[PDB]
Copies of this chain bind each other. A is one copy, B any other.
Amino acid sequence: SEESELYHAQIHLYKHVYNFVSSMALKSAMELGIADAIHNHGKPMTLSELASSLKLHPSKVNILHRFLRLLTHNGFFAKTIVKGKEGDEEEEIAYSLTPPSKLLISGKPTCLSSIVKGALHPSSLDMWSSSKKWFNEDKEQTLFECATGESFWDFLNKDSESSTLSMFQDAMASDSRMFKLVLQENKRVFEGLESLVDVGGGTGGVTKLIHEIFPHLKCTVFDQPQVVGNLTGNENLNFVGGDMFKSIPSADAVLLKWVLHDWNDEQSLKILKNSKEAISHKGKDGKVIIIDISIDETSDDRGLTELQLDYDLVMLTMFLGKERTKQEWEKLIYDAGFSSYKITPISGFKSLIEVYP
């Protein structure tokens, strides 16, 4: 017996084998618009009612039921027992939305539909059939290039991929929108700030959001001369062109939103150093705000670390990109000269790091 003790070993194995089914079940739920239907019904909905709302063929009803059962077990729906109308139904089960599923209700600031649709789009999953060829080849490329022949970006730009591109940029907009919510949920981060520099803020889209929640904050959008060049306006809105590797505008705080996952530790350290100098005049009152993923391998929420590692693997297979771990984030901020830092989990699995001198 000792050693050759299966079962515990098999349950674990199969559990990971069939994980994909849970994702496909969620995918279906959103592509069918179950949340919108129940929400529009605004009252626990019955299998028949939902079936009728989705205008499903009678043969597809029991398929809806099967998907509902699993999804309910996965916490995307709550089961209720409802009345019935006399000579029919007797005792029937009704379904209600749950916080997780409410995120799938469209026409709402919190809708994450487009994002889940892109994350589970065929162009995101089919490439995996080339994983073995990808591991054993001599060419350095993304798994997407290996399986498709072209890079992900070139694929979207094709003419026969017009719709695919609309979907992904809908997800992109949906992601930048959610930032607004991050601001709303973490006002204490920007509370005692008189000014802020949005490094690599491009045309000022993100600053605009910041201004929607904090109208009085003096924001200076910093980017390259060409990207900013002209642009002006507002007493609290600022556009200055320059090079973040040489110097970044002084302010109460420095925002680095999605600007460090593109640079290596060397280039990232210089940016952090220039960031510390830009707040240097505010002394121990200034702070650097980093918005990027941080994987906490030693976290107690194993599921969250796994989700983070999952995402990181998608960045690898699709773009050959990487996210940093909490420790390498620590090394970076300390090697830059800061005294402490505070990580705040945001948007499911992302992070908001507050760095203090």
Contacts and interface: CB of A to CB of B under 8 A. Distances in A.
Interface in A128-154: 128-129, 131-132, 134-140
B307 A15 contact: yes
A60 interface: yes
B6 A60 contact: no
B21 A16 contact: no
Interface in A14-34: 14-28, 31-32
Contacts of A134: 60, 63
A119 B49 CA distance: 34
A78 interface: no
A129 B122 contact: yes
A256 to B, nearest CB: 22
A18 B25 contact: no
A66 to B, nearest CB: 5
B66 A18 contact: no
A22 B19 contact: yes
Interface stretch (A67-75, A192-200, A205-213, A242-250): A67-75
A305 interface: yes
Given A309-B69, A316-B66, A31 B131 contact: yes
A335 interface: no
Nearest to A64: B135
A288 to B, nearest CB: 23
Given A18-B307, A22-B310, A306-B70, A135 B102 contact: no
B8 A99 contact: yes
Given A100-B13, A110-B6, A23 B32 contact: no
A56 B112 contact: no
B26 A23 contact: no
A81 B30 CA distance: 45
A136 B53 CA distance: 12
A181 interface: yes
A52 interface: no
Contact of A181 (B6, B20, B25, B122): B6
Contact of A67 (B56, B63, B99, B313): B313
A73 B306 contact: yes
Contacts of A31: 131-132, 135
A71 to B, nearest CB: 9
A66 B313 contact: yes
Which of A7, A116, A134, A314 is the most central at the interface, judged by chain B CB atoms within 10 Å of its CB? A7
Interface of A: 4-28, 31-32, 54-57, 59-60, 63-64, 66-67, 69-70, 73-76, 99-100, 102-103, 110, 112, 116, 119-120, 122, 125-126, 128-129, 131-132, 134-140, 181, 185, 297, 302-307, 309-314, 316, 322, 345-349
Given A6-B185, A16-B74, 17 more contacts: A9-B100, A9-B103, A12-B75, A13-B112, A13-B116, A14-B307, A15-B304, A16-B23, A16-B76, A17-B116, A22-B310, A28-B131, A28-B132, A31-B131, A31-B135, A32-B132, A70-B309
19 contacts: A6-B99, A7-B185, A8-B99, A9-B102, A10-B347, A10-B348, A11-B304, A12-B99, A13-B26, A13-B100, A14-B311, A14-B348, A18-B310, A20-B24, A31-B131, A57-B137, A60-B134, A70-B313, A73-B309
Q: Report, nearest first, the 7 A-B pairs whose CB atoms are least far apart.
A: A10-B348, A9-B99, A21-B310, A59-B140, A18-B310, A20-B20, A14-B348
